[PDB]
Amino acid sequence: GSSGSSGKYVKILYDFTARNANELSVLKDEVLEVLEDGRQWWKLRSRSGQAGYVPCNILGEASGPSSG
Numbered sequence: 001g002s003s004g005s006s007g008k009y010v011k012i013l014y015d016f017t018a019r020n021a022n023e024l025s026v027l028k029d030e031v032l033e034v035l036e037d038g039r040q041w042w043k044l045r046s047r048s049g050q051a052g053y054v055p056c057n058i059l060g061e062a063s064g065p066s067s068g
Contacts, residue, residue, distance in 0.1 A: 007033075007034070008034055008062070009031050009032065009033060009034060009062045010031065010032055010034050010042065010044060010059050010060065010061075010062050011029070011030070011031045011060055011061075011062040012026045012027060012028055012029065012030040012031070012032065012058060012059070012060075013028065013058050013059070013060045014028060014058040015027045015028040015030075016054055016055075016058055018052050018054075021052065022052060022053055023052045023053055023054060024043075024044055024045075024046065024050060024051065024052025024053065024054050025046075025052070026044070026046070026054065031062055032044030032045060032046060033045045035051065040056075041053040041054055041055055041056065042054060042056050042059055
């Protein structure tokens with residue numbers, strides 16, 4: 001089952017079009033769920049239930065104004 005309920009996320013900076021399955025298709029101003037980090041390409045997962053790899057170049061730190 002679910003391990004953690006409170007982790008981290010990434011806010012897409014540039015709209016990316018997954019060239020293949022291995023890749024994930026995201027848009028700008030989007031927030032996916034980071035699964036694998038500290039690696040060449042991160043593995044995010046859309047709300048649709050899809051998971052792919054993308055460049056961290058477009059990735060960016062996601063933070064909120066009021067949320068401890």
